[PDB]
Structures are given as structure tokens and as C-alpha cells.
CSV table of C-alpha atoms (C1' of nucleotides) and ligand atoms in Angstrom, one decimal:
chain,number,residue,atom,x,y,z
A,1,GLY,CA,2.2,-3.0,-0.9
A,2,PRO,CA,0.0,0.0,0.0
A,3,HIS,CA,2.9,2.4,0.4
A,4,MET,CA,5.2,1.3,-2.5
A,5,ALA,CA,5.1,3.7,-5.4
A,6,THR,CA,4.8,2.1,-8.9
A,7,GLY,CA,5.7,4.9,-11.3
A,8,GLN,CA,2.2,5.0,-12.9
A,9,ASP,CA,1.5,8.7,-12.2
A,10,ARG,CA,2.1,10.1,-15.7
A,11,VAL,CA,1.4,9.4,-19.3
A,12,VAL,CA,4.5,10.2,-21.4
A,13,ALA,CA,5.1,9.8,-25.1
A,14,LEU,CA,8.3,10.0,-27.1
A,15,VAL,CA,7.7,10.9,-30.8
A,16,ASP,CA,10.6,10.2,-33.2
A,17,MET,CA,10.6,10.9,-37.0
A,18,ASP,CA,11.4,7.9,-39.3
A,19,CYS,CA,14.7,8.3,-41.2
A,20,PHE,CA,14.3,12.0,-40.8
A,21,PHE,CA,16.8,13.7,-43.1
A,22,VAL,CA,15.8,11.2,-45.8
A,23,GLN,CA,12.0,12.0,-45.5
A,24,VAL,CA,12.9,15.8,-45.8
A,25,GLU,CA,14.7,15.1,-49.1
A,26,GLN,CA,12.0,12.7,-50.3
A,27,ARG,CA,9.2,15.2,-49.7
A,28,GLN,CA,11.1,17.8,-51.8
A,29,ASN,CA,12.2,15.4,-54.6
A,30,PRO,CA,9.4,12.9,-55.4
A,31,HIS,CA,11.9,10.7,-57.4
A,32,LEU,CA,13.4,9.6,-54.1
A,33,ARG,CA,10.1,8.5,-52.6
A,34,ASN,CA,9.7,4.7,-51.8
A,35,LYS,CA,13.2,4.0,-53.0
A,36,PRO,CA,16.4,2.8,-51.4
A,37,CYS,CA,18.0,6.1,-50.6
A,38,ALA,CA,20.4,7.9,-48.3
A,39,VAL,CA,21.6,11.4,-47.4
A,40,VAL,CA,25.3,12.2,-47.5
A,41,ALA,CA,27.6,14.9,-46.3
A,42,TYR,CA,30.2,15.9,-48.9
A,43,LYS,CA,31.2,13.9,-52.0
A,44,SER,CA,34.9,14.0,-52.6
A,45,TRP,CA,36.1,11.4,-50.1
A,46,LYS,CA,34.7,7.9,-51.0
A,47,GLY,CA,31.4,9.4,-52.3
A,48,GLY,CA,30.6,11.1,-49.0
A,49,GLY,CA,29.5,10.0,-45.5
A,50,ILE,CA,26.0,8.6,-45.1
A,51,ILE,CA,24.1,10.4,-42.4
A,52,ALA,CA,20.6,8.9,-42.9
A,53,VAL,CA,19.2,5.8,-44.6
A,54,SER,CA,15.7,5.0,-45.9
A,55,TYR,CA,14.2,1.7,-44.7
A,56,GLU,CA,14.2,0.3,-48.3
A,57,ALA,CA,18.0,0.8,-48.3
A,58,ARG,CA,18.5,-0.6,-44.8
A,59,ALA,CA,17.0,-3.9,-46.2
A,60,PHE,CA,20.2,-4.1,-48.3
A,61,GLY,CA,22.4,-3.6,-45.1
A,62,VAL,CA,23.2,0.0,-45.7
A,63,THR,CA,23.8,2.0,-42.5
A,64,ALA,CA,24.9,5.5,-41.4
A,65,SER,CA,28.6,6.0,-41.0
A,66,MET,CA,29.1,4.0,-44.2
A,67,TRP,CA,30.9,5.7,-47.0
A,68,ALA,CA,28.6,6.1,-50.0
A,69,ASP,CA,31.0,4.1,-52.3
A,70,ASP,CA,30.9,1.2,-49.9
A,71,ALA,CA,27.1,1.4,-49.5
A,72,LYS,CA,26.9,1.2,-53.3
A,73,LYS,CA,28.6,-2.3,-53.1
A,74,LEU,CA,25.7,-3.5,-51.0
A,75,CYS,CA,23.0,-1.5,-52.8
A,76,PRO,CA,24.0,-0.7,-56.4
A,77,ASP,CA,20.7,1.2,-57.2
A,78,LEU,CA,21.1,3.3,-54.0
A,79,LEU,CA,19.9,6.9,-54.6
A,80,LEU,CA,21.6,9.8,-52.9
A,81,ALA,CA,20.7,13.3,-51.7
A,82,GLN,CA,23.4,15.6,-50.4
A,83,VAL,CA,23.4,18.0,-47.6
A,84,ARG,CA,23.5,21.6,-48.7
A,85,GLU,CA,27.0,23.0,-48.6
A,86,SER,CA,27.7,26.7,-47.6
A,87,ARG,CA,31.0,28.4,-47.0
A,88,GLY,CA,32.8,25.1,-47.4
A,89,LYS,CA,30.7,23.3,-44.9
A,90,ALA,CA,27.6,21.2,-44.4
A,91,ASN,CA,24.5,23.3,-43.6
A,92,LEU,CA,21.6,21.7,-41.7
A,93,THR,CA,19.1,24.6,-42.1
A,94,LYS,CA,16.7,22.5,-44.3
A,95,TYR,CA,16.4,19.9,-41.5
A,96,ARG,CA,16.2,22.4,-38.7
A,97,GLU,CA,13.3,24.1,-40.5
A,98,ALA,CA,11.5,20.8,-41.2
A,99,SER,CA,12.0,20.1,-37.4
A,100,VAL,CA,10.2,23.3,-36.5
A,101,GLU,CA,7.3,22.2,-38.7
A,102,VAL,CA,6.9,19.1,-36.6
A,103,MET,CA,7.5,20.6,-33.2
A,104,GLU,CA,4.9,23.3,-33.7
A,105,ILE,CA,2.2,20.7,-34.6
A,106,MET,CA,3.1,18.6,-31.5
A,107,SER,CA,3.0,21.7,-29.3
A,108,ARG,CA,-0.7,22.1,-30.2
A,109,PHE,CA,-1.5,18.9,-28.3
A,110,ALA,CA,0.6,19.4,-25.2
A,111,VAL,CA,3.8,20.8,-23.7
A,112,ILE,CA,6.8,19.2,-25.4
A,113,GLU,CA,10.5,18.7,-24.6
A,114,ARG,CA,12.6,19.0,-27.8
A,115,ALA,CA,15.0,16.1,-27.3
A,116,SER,CA,16.8,16.3,-30.7
A,117,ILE,CA,16.2,17.7,-34.2
A,118,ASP,CA,13.7,14.9,-34.8
A,119,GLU,CA,12.4,13.8,-31.4
A,120,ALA,CA,10.2,15.3,-28.6
A,121,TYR,CA,8.8,14.0,-25.4
A,122,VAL,CA,5.1,14.9,-24.5
A,123,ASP,CA,3.5,14.8,-21.0
A,124,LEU,CA,-0.1,13.8,-21.9
A,125,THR,CA,-1.3,13.3,-18.3
A,126,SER,CA,-3.6,16.4,-18.3
A,127,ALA,CA,-4.7,15.9,-21.9
A,128,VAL,CA,-5.6,12.3,-21.0
A,129,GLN,CA,-7.7,13.4,-18.0
A,130,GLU,CA,-9.5,15.8,-20.3
A,131,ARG,CA,-10.3,13.1,-22.9
A,132,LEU,CA,-11.4,10.9,-20.0
A,133,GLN,CA,-13.9,13.6,-18.9
A,134,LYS,CA,-15.4,13.5,-22.3
A,135,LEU,CA,-16.1,10.0,-23.5
A,136,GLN,CA,-17.8,9.4,-20.2
A,137,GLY,CA,-17.1,5.8,-19.4
A,138,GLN,CA,-17.6,4.6,-23.0
A,139,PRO,CA,-15.5,1.8,-24.6
A,140,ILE,CA,-12.4,2.5,-26.7
A,141,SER,CA,-12.6,0.7,-30.0
A,142,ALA,CA,-9.6,-0.8,-31.8
A,143,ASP,CA,-10.5,1.6,-34.7
A,144,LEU,CA,-9.1,4.5,-32.6
A,145,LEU,CA,-5.7,2.7,-32.5
A,146,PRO,CA,-5.0,1.7,-36.1
A,147,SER,CA,-1.1,1.7,-35.7
A,148,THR,CA,-0.7,0.9,-32.0
A,149,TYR,CA,1.2,-2.2,-30.7
A,150,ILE,CA,0.6,-3.4,-27.2
A,151,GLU,CA,4.0,-4.7,-25.9
A,152,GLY,CA,3.8,-8.2,-24.5
A,153,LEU,CA,0.6,-9.1,-26.4
A,154,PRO,CA,-0.8,-11.3,-27.7
A,155,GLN,CA,-0.1,-14.1,-25.3
A,156,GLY,CA,-1.7,-17.6,-25.0
A,157,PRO,CA,-4.5,-18.5,-27.4
A,158,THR,CA,-1.8,-15.2,-36.5
A,159,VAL,CA,0.7,-15.8,-39.3
A,160,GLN,CA,1.1,-12.2,-40.4
A,161,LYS,CA,2.4,-9.0,-38.7
A,162,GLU,CA,-0.8,-7.0,-38.8
A,163,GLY,CA,-2.7,-10.1,-37.6
A,164,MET,CA,-0.5,-10.3,-34.5
A,165,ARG,CA,-0.8,-6.5,-33.9
A,166,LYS,CA,-4.6,-6.7,-33.8
A,167,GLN,CA,-4.8,-9.9,-31.7
A,168,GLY,CA,-2.7,-8.2,-29.1
A,169,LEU,CA,-4.7,-5.0,-29.3
A,170,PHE,CA,-8.0,-7.0,-28.9
A,171,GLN,CA,-6.7,-8.9,-25.9
A,172,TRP,CA,-5.6,-5.5,-24.4
A,173,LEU,CA,-8.9,-3.7,-25.0
A,174,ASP,CA,-11.0,-6.7,-23.9
A,175,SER,CA,-9.3,-6.7,-20.5
A,176,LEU,CA,-9.5,-2.9,-20.1
A,177,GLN,CA,-11.6,-1.6,-17.2
A,178,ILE,CA,-13.1,1.7,-18.6
A,179,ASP,CA,-15.2,2.6,-15.6
A,180,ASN,CA,-12.2,3.5,-13.5
A,181,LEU,CA,-10.8,6.8,-14.6
A,182,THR,CA,-7.8,6.3,-12.2
A,183,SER,CA,-6.6,3.0,-14.0
A,184,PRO,CA,-3.1,3.6,-15.2
A,185,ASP,CA,-3.7,1.2,-18.1
A,186,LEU,CA,-6.8,3.1,-19.2
A,187,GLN,CA,-4.8,6.3,-19.1
A,188,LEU,CA,-2.0,4.8,-21.3
A,189,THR,CA,-4.7,3.6,-23.7
A,190,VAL,CA,-6.2,7.1,-24.0
A,191,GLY,CA,-2.7,8.5,-24.2
A,192,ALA,CA,-2.1,6.3,-27.3
A,193,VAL,CA,-5.4,7.4,-28.8
A,194,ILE,CA,-4.2,11.0,-28.6
A,195,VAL,CA,-0.8,10.0,-30.1
A,196,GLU,CA,-2.5,8.4,-33.1
A,197,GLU,CA,-4.2,11.8,-33.6
A,198,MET,CA,-0.9,13.7,-33.2
A,199,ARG,CA,0.9,11.4,-35.6
A,200,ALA,CA,-2.0,11.7,-38.1
A,201,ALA,CA,-1.8,15.5,-37.9
A,202,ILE,CA,2.0,15.5,-38.4
A,203,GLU,CA,1.7,13.4,-41.5
A,204,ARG,CA,-1.3,15.3,-42.9
A,205,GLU,CA,0.3,18.7,-42.5
A,206,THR,CA,3.9,17.9,-43.3
A,207,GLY,CA,3.9,14.6,-45.2
A,208,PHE,CA,6.4,13.2,-42.7
A,209,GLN,CA,5.8,9.8,-41.0
A,210,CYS,CA,7.0,8.9,-37.4
A,211,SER,CA,6.9,6.4,-34.6
A,212,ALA,CA,6.1,6.9,-31.0
A,213,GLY,CA,6.3,5.2,-27.6
A,214,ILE,CA,3.7,5.6,-24.9
A,215,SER,CA,4.4,4.7,-21.3
A,216,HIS,CA,4.6,6.2,-17.8
A,217,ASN,CA,8.0,7.9,-18.1
A,218,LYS,CA,10.5,9.1,-20.6
A,219,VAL,CA,12.9,6.1,-20.6
A,220,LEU,CA,10.1,3.6,-21.2
A,221,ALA,CA,8.5,5.8,-23.8
A,222,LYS,CA,11.9,6.1,-25.6
A,223,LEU,CA,12.4,2.3,-25.4
A,224,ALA,CA,8.8,1.7,-26.5
A,225,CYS,CA,9.2,4.0,-29.6
A,226,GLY,CA,11.9,1.8,-31.2
A,227,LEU,CA,10.1,-1.5,-30.7
A,228,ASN,CA,8.0,-1.1,-33.8
A,229,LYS,CA,9.5,1.2,-36.4
A,230,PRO,CA,8.7,2.7,-38.9
A,231,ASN,CA,5.3,4.4,-39.0
A,232,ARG,CA,3.9,2.6,-35.9
A,233,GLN,CA,3.5,3.3,-32.2
A,234,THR,CA,3.9,1.2,-29.1
A,235,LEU,CA,2.3,1.2,-25.7
A,236,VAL,CA,4.5,-0.2,-22.9
A,237,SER,CA,2.4,-0.8,-19.7
A,238,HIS,CA,3.8,-1.0,-16.2
A,239,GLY,CA,2.8,-4.6,-16.1
A,240,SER,CA,4.8,-5.4,-19.2
A,241,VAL,CA,8.1,-4.5,-17.7
A,242,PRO,CA,9.2,-7.7,-15.9
A,243,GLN,CA,9.0,-9.8,-19.1
A,244,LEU,CA,10.3,-7.0,-21.4
A,245,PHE,CA,13.2,-6.3,-19.1
A,246,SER,CA,14.0,-9.9,-18.4
A,247,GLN,CA,15.8,-10.3,-21.8
A,248,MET,CA,16.5,-6.7,-22.4
A,249,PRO,CA,20.2,-5.9,-22.8
A,250,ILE,CA,21.3,-3.2,-20.4
A,251,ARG,CA,22.8,-1.1,-23.2
A,252,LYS,CA,19.4,-0.6,-24.7
A,253,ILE,CA,18.1,1.7,-22.0
A,254,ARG,CA,18.7,5.4,-22.3
A,255,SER,CA,21.9,6.6,-20.5
A,256,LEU,CA,23.2,3.0,-20.1
A,257,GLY,CA,24.5,2.7,-23.7
A,258,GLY,CA,28.0,3.9,-22.8
A,259,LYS,CA,30.5,3.6,-20.0
A,260,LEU,CA,28.1,3.4,-17.0
A,261,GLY,CA,26.2,0.5,-18.7
A,262,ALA,CA,29.4,-1.3,-19.3
A,263,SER,CA,30.4,-0.9,-15.6
A,264,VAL,CA,27.0,-2.2,-14.6
A,265,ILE,CA,27.5,-5.3,-16.7
A,266,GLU,CA,31.1,-5.9,-15.6
A,267,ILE,CA,31.0,-5.2,-11.9
A,268,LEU,CA,27.6,-7.0,-11.3
A,269,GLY,CA,28.2,-9.7,-13.8
A,270,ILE,CA,24.7,-9.4,-15.3
A,271,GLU,CA,23.3,-8.9,-18.9
A,272,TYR,CA,19.7,-7.8,-18.8
A,273,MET,CA,17.9,-4.9,-17.1
A,274,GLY,CA,15.6,-7.2,-15.0
A,275,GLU,CA,18.6,-8.7,-13.3
A,276,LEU,CA,19.2,-5.4,-11.5
A,277,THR,CA,16.2,-6.0,-9.3
A,278,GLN,CA,18.2,-8.5,-7.2
A,279,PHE,CA,20.5,-5.7,-5.8
A,280,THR,CA,19.6,-3.4,-2.9
A,281,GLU,CA,19.5,0.3,-3.5
A,282,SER,CA,22.5,0.6,-1.2
A,283,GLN,CA,24.6,-1.9,-3.1
A,284,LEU,CA,23.9,-0.1,-6.4
A,285,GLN,CA,24.7,3.2,-4.8
A,286,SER,CA,28.0,1.8,-3.5
A,287,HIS,CA,29.0,0.6,-7.0
A,288,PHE,CA,27.8,3.5,-9.2
A,289,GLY,CA,27.2,6.5,-6.9
A,290,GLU,CA,24.1,7.7,-5.0
A,291,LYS,CA,22.3,9.3,-7.9
A,292,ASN,CA,23.0,6.5,-10.4
A,293,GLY,CA,22.3,3.8,-7.8
A,294,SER,CA,18.9,5.3,-6.8
A,295,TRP,CA,18.1,5.8,-10.5
A,296,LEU,CA,19.0,2.2,-11.4
A,297,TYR,CA,17.1,0.7,-8.4
A,298,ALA,CA,13.9,2.4,-9.6
A,299,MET,CA,14.4,2.1,-13.3
A,300,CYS,CA,14.8,-1.7,-13.3
A,301,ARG,CA,11.3,-1.8,-11.8
A,302,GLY,CA,10.1,0.5,-14.7
A,303,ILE,CA,10.0,3.6,-12.4
A,304,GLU,CA,11.6,6.9,-13.4
A,305,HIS,CA,10.7,10.5,-12.5
A,306,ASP,CA,12.7,12.7,-14.9
A,307,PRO,CA,10.2,15.4,-15.9
A,308,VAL,CA,9.2,16.4,-19.4
A,309,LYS,CA,10.8,19.8,-19.5
A,310,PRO,CA,8.9,22.7,-21.1
A,311,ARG,CA,11.5,23.5,-23.8
A,312,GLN,CA,10.7,23.7,-27.5
A,313,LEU,CA,13.9,25.6,-28.6
A,314,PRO,CA,17.5,24.6,-28.3
A,315,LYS,CA,19.5,26.2,-25.5
A,316,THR,CA,22.6,26.6,-27.6
A,317,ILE,CA,23.4,27.5,-31.3
A,318,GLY,CA,26.6,26.0,-32.7
A,319,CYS,CA,28.6,25.6,-35.9
A,320,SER,CA,31.2,22.9,-36.2
A,321,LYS,CA,33.6,21.5,-38.8
A,322,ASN,CA,36.0,18.6,-38.7
A,323,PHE,CA,39.3,18.6,-40.4
A,324,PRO,CA,40.5,15.0,-40.4
A,325,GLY,CA,43.7,13.5,-41.6
A,326,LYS,CA,45.7,15.5,-44.1
A,327,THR,CA,43.1,18.2,-44.2
A,328,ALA,CA,43.9,19.3,-40.6
A,329,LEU,CA,44.6,23.0,-40.3
A,330,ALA,CA,48.3,23.6,-40.4
A,331,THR,CA,48.7,27.4,-40.8
A,332,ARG,CA,47.5,30.5,-38.9
A,333,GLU,CA,45.8,31.7,-42.1
A,334,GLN,CA,43.7,28.6,-42.4
A,335,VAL,CA,42.6,28.7,-38.8
A,336,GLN,CA,41.5,32.3,-39.2
A,337,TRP,CA,39.7,31.6,-42.5
A,338,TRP,CA,37.7,28.7,-41.1
A,339,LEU,CA,36.9,30.6,-37.9
A,340,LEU,CA,35.5,33.3,-40.2
A,341,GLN,CA,33.4,30.8,-42.2
A,342,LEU,CA,31.9,29.3,-39.0
A,343,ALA,CA,31.3,32.7,-37.4
A,344,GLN,CA,29.4,33.8,-40.6
A,345,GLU,CA,27.0,30.9,-40.5
A,346,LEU,CA,26.7,31.4,-36.7
A,347,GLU,CA,25.9,35.1,-37.2
A,348,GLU,CA,23.2,34.2,-39.8
A,349,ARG,CA,21.6,31.7,-37.4
A,350,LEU,CA,21.8,34.0,-34.4
A,351,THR,CA,20.1,37.0,-36.2
A,352,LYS,CA,17.3,34.7,-37.2
A,353,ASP,CA,17.0,33.3,-33.7
A,354,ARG,CA,16.8,36.7,-32.1
A,355,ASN,CA,14.1,37.9,-34.5
A,356,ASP,CA,12.0,34.7,-34.1
A,357,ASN,CA,12.4,33.9,-30.4
A,358,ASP,CA,13.1,37.2,-28.8
A,359,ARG,CA,16.3,36.3,-27.1
A,360,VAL,CA,20.1,37.0,-27.4
A,361,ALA,CA,23.1,34.9,-26.7
A,362,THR,CA,25.7,36.4,-24.3
A,363,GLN,CA,28.6,33.9,-24.3
A,364,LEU,CA,30.7,32.5,-27.1
A,365,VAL,CA,32.2,29.1,-26.5
A,366,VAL,CA,35.2,28.2,-28.6
A,367,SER,CA,36.3,24.5,-28.8
A,368,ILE,CA,39.1,22.9,-30.8
A,369,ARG,CA,40.6,19.4,-31.3
A,370,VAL,CA,44.3,18.7,-31.8
A,371,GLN,CA,45.7,16.1,-34.1
A,372,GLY,CA,46.0,12.9,-32.1
A,373,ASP,CA,42.9,13.3,-30.0
A,374,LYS,CA,44.1,15.5,-27.2
A,375,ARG,CA,42.1,15.7,-23.9
A,376,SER,CA,37.4,18.3,-27.7
A,377,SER,CA,41.0,19.1,-26.7
A,378,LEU,CA,40.3,22.6,-25.4
A,379,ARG,CA,37.3,24.8,-24.6
A,380,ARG,CA,37.5,28.6,-23.9
A,381,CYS,CA,34.9,31.3,-23.7
A,382,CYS,CA,34.5,35.1,-24.3
A,383,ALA,CA,31.7,37.6,-24.2
A,384,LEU,CA,29.3,37.6,-27.2
A,385,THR,CA,28.3,41.2,-27.3
A,386,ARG,CA,27.6,41.7,-31.0
A,387,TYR,CA,26.1,39.4,-33.7
A,388,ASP,CA,29.0,40.2,-36.0
A,389,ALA,CA,31.0,37.5,-37.7
A,390,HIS,CA,34.3,39.3,-38.0
A,391,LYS,CA,34.3,40.1,-34.3
A,392,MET,CA,33.3,36.6,-33.2
A,393,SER,CA,35.9,34.9,-35.4
A,394,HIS,CA,38.5,37.4,-34.2
A,395,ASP,CA,37.6,36.9,-30.5
A,396,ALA,CA,37.6,33.1,-30.9
A,397,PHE,CA,41.1,33.3,-32.4
A,398,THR,CA,42.2,35.5,-29.5
A,399,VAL,CA,41.2,33.0,-26.9
A,400,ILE,CA,42.8,29.9,-28.6
A,401,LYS,CA,45.9,31.3,-30.2
A,402,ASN,CA,48.0,30.6,-27.1
A,403,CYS,CA,47.5,26.9,-27.7
A,404,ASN,CA,49.7,27.1,-30.8
A,405,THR,CA,53.1,25.6,-30.1
A,406,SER,CA,54.7,26.9,-33.2
A,407,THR,CA,52.6,31.7,-39.9
A,408,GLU,CA,52.6,28.0,-38.8
A,409,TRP,CA,50.1,26.3,-36.5
A,410,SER,CA,51.0,23.2,-34.6
A,411,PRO,CA,49.7,20.8,-33.6
A,412,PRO,CA,47.3,20.7,-36.6
A,413,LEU,CA,43.6,21.3,-35.6
A,414,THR,CA,41.3,18.5,-36.6
A,415,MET,CA,38.2,20.4,-35.5
A,416,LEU,CA,36.8,23.9,-34.8
A,417,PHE,CA,33.6,24.6,-33.0
A,418,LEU,CA,31.9,27.9,-32.2
A,419,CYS,CA,28.9,27.8,-29.9
A,420,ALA,CA,26.6,30.7,-28.8
A,421,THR,CA,25.1,30.2,-25.4
A,422,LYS,CA,23.8,31.8,-22.1
A,423,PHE,CA,20.7,33.4,-23.7
A,424,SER,CA,18.7,36.3,-22.2
A,425,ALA,CA,15.4,37.8,-23.2
A,426,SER,CA,14.9,39.5,-25.4
B,1,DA,C1',37.8,6.8,-39.3
B,2,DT,C1',29.3,10.3,-40.8
B,3,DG,C1',30.7,14.8,-39.6
B,4,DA,C1',27.4,18.1,-37.3
B,5,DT,C1',25.4,18.9,-33.9
B,6,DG,C1',22.9,19.2,-28.6
B,7,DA,C1',21.9,18.4,-23.3
B,8,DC,C1',23.6,17.7,-18.9
B,9,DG,C1',27.0,15.9,-15.0
B,10,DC,C1',31.3,16.6,-12.3
B,11,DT,C1',34.6,19.2,-9.9
C,1,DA,C1',35.2,27.5,-15.5
C,2,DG,C1',36.8,23.5,-18.1
C,3,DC,C1',36.4,18.7,-19.0
C,4,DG,C1',33.6,14.4,-19.5
C,5,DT,C1',29.5,11.4,-20.8
C,6,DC,C1',25.6,10.3,-23.6
C,7,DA,C1',22.9,10.9,-27.3
C,8,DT,C1',20.6,12.1,-32.4
D,501,DCP,N1,24.9,10.4,-35.4
D,501,DCP,C1,23.9,11.0,-36.1
D,501,DCP,C2,22.6,10.5,-35.9
D,501,DCP,C3,21.6,11.1,-36.6
D,501,DCP,N2,21.8,12.2,-37.3
D,501,DCP,C4,20.7,12.9,-38.1
D,501,DCP,C5,20.3,12.1,-39.3
D,501,DCP,C6,18.9,11.5,-38.9
D,501,DCP,O1,18.0,11.4,-40.0
D,501,DCP,C7,18.4,12.4,-37.8
D,501,DCP,C8,17.6,11.7,-36.8
D,501,DCP,O2,18.5,10.6,-36.3
D,501,DCP,P1,17.9,9.2,-35.8
D,501,DCP,O3,18.9,8.6,-34.9
D,501,DCP,O4,16.5,9.4,-35.3
D,501,DCP,O5,17.9,8.4,-37.2
D,501,DCP,P2,16.7,8.5,-38.3
D,501,DCP,O6,15.6,9.4,-37.9
D,501,DCP,O7,17.4,8.8,-39.6
D,501,DCP,O8,16.2,7.0,-38.4
D,501,DCP,P3,15.2,6.2,-37.5
D,501,DCP,O9,14.0,6.0,-38.4
D,501,DCP,O10,16.0,5.0,-37.1
D,501,DCP,O11,15.0,7.1,-36.3
D,501,DCP,O12,19.6,13.0,-37.2
D,501,DCP,C9,23.1,12.7,-37.5
D,501,DCP,O13,23.2,13.7,-38.2
D,501,DCP,N3,24.1,12.1,-36.8
D,502,CA,CA1,14.4,9.2,-36.0
D,503,CA,CA1,15.8,10.6,-33.2
DNA sequence: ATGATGACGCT
DNA sequence: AGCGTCAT
């Protein structure tokens, strides 16, 4: 139990666009539609680096971080769109703008947290209560959930994918107690009805398809989203967690895909998320720190309290370019010229941002990488007082020039990064 | 060695 | 403040 919390207090969705940069290019160029295709940055080196891949091309084994020339070996008919190039660098404006299209539609339904260029979390708790006030006690038909998967179902007593989806959904809805407006499962179900609507509106008004996850917190909603991609949505109930987590590799859960997840596996000698339940909160805290330990203890039971933050715009605006291998900047003149190119794109994006969103950045963060992967090697800041490219590139040079151990610059820089931050209204 | 981003934690 | 981790 009567005093044990179960993490069923919210309805949270994570919406993520399907092969996003590819859809943006396919909307614009109908020849690319329903074909194996990919988006590449640059062209000179091995046909360019693949940044995004349609599902038709994934069926040939093509992935991101492949060189286009190598992708062609797996998929000879592969079609390519390339990222716009401005001032000698890749420019993502087209995708940032398509992103705004989608975010503004989602923001009509509820408060969103912009999680990336093509993903947003939604807290649907209030919206769900609303929809439950209307539809006073009346059944939810499977027709309101035409693309929803219920994770863990069907169980017990078809041969095709859509057959299985529906069988599971029928089992789910048949068991659903609609007379209790406090039922966590009913609330998730209504949550999923709203997300069907949201996803319909996105596709109607933009042409873009997406997937979604619906559950009681962000981590489960994110996990749920990727269970049935593309163009589908997945409901992960509290009750589904023990079986789902029982064979779920630790690295699949958000924030456990890197070093901490590896420590968890190595120190505890476990593989799957469910196995974490057999450790006390104190043991987990002793191994991984108080915050991580408490987080892990709750999370392996499907419980997480990270709030959906009310934030629709990025908190930073940055411009970055890598200079790998022989292309690494070796002279002072090069460093200054590329700082200028970056500052000019940055100035362009800052002026737009100020006009649109009534805010101004006050700090300029300058970050470089040295040949050989020193320490980002180095990060320094200065005041951003004027949206002026020549001043910003000059200031950035001023704060990094001391790092030169040499007309010549050594060690060669393999990356430059300018980032505007610490925004104030207006 | 996708190269281009973005959010947040630690000290 | 500057570096590290984790992710799209
Ligand atoms: N390391 C990465 C990962 C992604 N992206 C870009 C290209 C993607 O189209 C977009 C969204 O990334 P996702 O990881 O969501 O991948 P997609 O949306 O392309 O595919 P999926 O349908 O698997 O989400 O961000 C990128 O530039 N660099
Ligand atoms: Ca995506
Ligand atoms: Ca994404």
C-alpha cells in the first residue's frame, strides 16, 4: 504494498521521425520516394559520408557512417541526396526548419520537450484526464488505435504482422476496465489514442511519418518507440516491464549505452535490465554513486521521475567542422579563415533566432581538437556582445591562439567549434 | 575513421 | 570554469 510507489503517475510519449533527413529530401524530390536512398555529407572522399538511410536501403544492409562508395557495393541502385554546402561546410538549415514544422504541430497537443532535431517528449497526463472527462465511461474501439502495438501481447491462445498487432490490441482492450478513470492502463490507452491523432496531424500537415512510444516515463516511452518502427506506435504498460526487461540488454536503456552501462554489466556480472532487481539500492549506490544507484534501483522496476521539461527551442546554437587526416589546419591563415566561415554561419543563425524567439546569446564558447585526440581538446569562452561574424571569429582566435606551439600552426587542428550560449530575453 | 550537432553531470 | 558522458 500500500505504500510502495509504482511509477504510474504520468502518461509520457516520445515521438521520433522515421529516417528524418531522408524524408525531408524525399518530400522535396518525389523521385526519391519509396526507393532505397540515403543522405550524404560531402562527396569527394569515398562518395561522401552517409548520415541517414531509408528503410528500403536498410534492407540491403546500408547503414549510417558508411561511405557512399561502400554502400553502393551492398546496394547498387542506392539513390543519394546531399546536404547543402555553404562556406565550405555542411549546412543543416533545411532539416532544422523541417524540425520546426513538426515541433509546432506537436505543441498544439501538449507541452513538449525538444529532445533532438527529430524527437520530442510529450507529457499527456492532463490531456488524458481531459479526454477521459469527455467519452464518459464509453469503450475504446480498436479503430481509434490503427497503428498501436501493445508490448507483450498477444499471449496464449496469427501468421502475419498486422494479424499479431490486432490480436494483441483486442486482448488488451477486452481486458481494459473503462469505468475507473484512475486506472493507469486506461490512461495509457487514452494516451495512445491522442498520439494516433498527433501522428496523423503531423503526416497530414507535413507529409512526414514517425513512430512513438507511450508509457509512464521518458525512458520507457523512448524504449517503446523503437520497438515497432517505422510508422507505428507502441504502448508499454507498467505490467509489461518484468518480461520485457527480463531479456533486455542493459545497453538498450537510455543513458546506459555507454561507460556506465558497461560498468554495470562488468561489476555486477549481469546482462539484462531485469537482473538489476536483485540488488539493494545501497549496493547499487556503493558501486555507481548515490544518484546512479537510486536511478538504477527504480528504473529496473520500470520507475523513473525525470520530468518532461517545457522546452521547445535549443539552449545553444553552434557551428562545427571537422578537419580529419591530411586536411587538418596547419597554418594560422587557415585557422582564421575557417573561424570566419563558422562565425558567418553562426551570425546568420543568431540573427534569425533573435528575430524569431526574442532572445540574445551572451557567451561564445570556442572549442578545438588537436591532431592525435588531445584531452574536444580545449574549450574557452568570451563575451558575445555583437552578432557580428568578424568580431566573433577574431575573439575566438584571440582565446585559442595561445594553444599554438609553433605563420605556422602546430599541432594541426582536426576540429573547430563555435557555440553561442547563455541566452537572455529578449 | 558520418561529420554536425545538442543536453547535462562533475569538480 | 573547463572537462567528460551520452545521445541524435
Ligand atoms: N549520429 C547521427 C545520428 C543522426 N543524425 C541525423 C540524421 C537523422 O536522419 C536524424 C535523426 O536521427 P535518428 O537517430 O533518429 O535516425 P533517423 O531518424 O534517420 O532513423 P530512425 O527511423 O532509425 O529514427 O539526425 C546525425 O546527423 N548524426
Ligand atoms: Ca528518428
Ligand atoms: Ca531521433
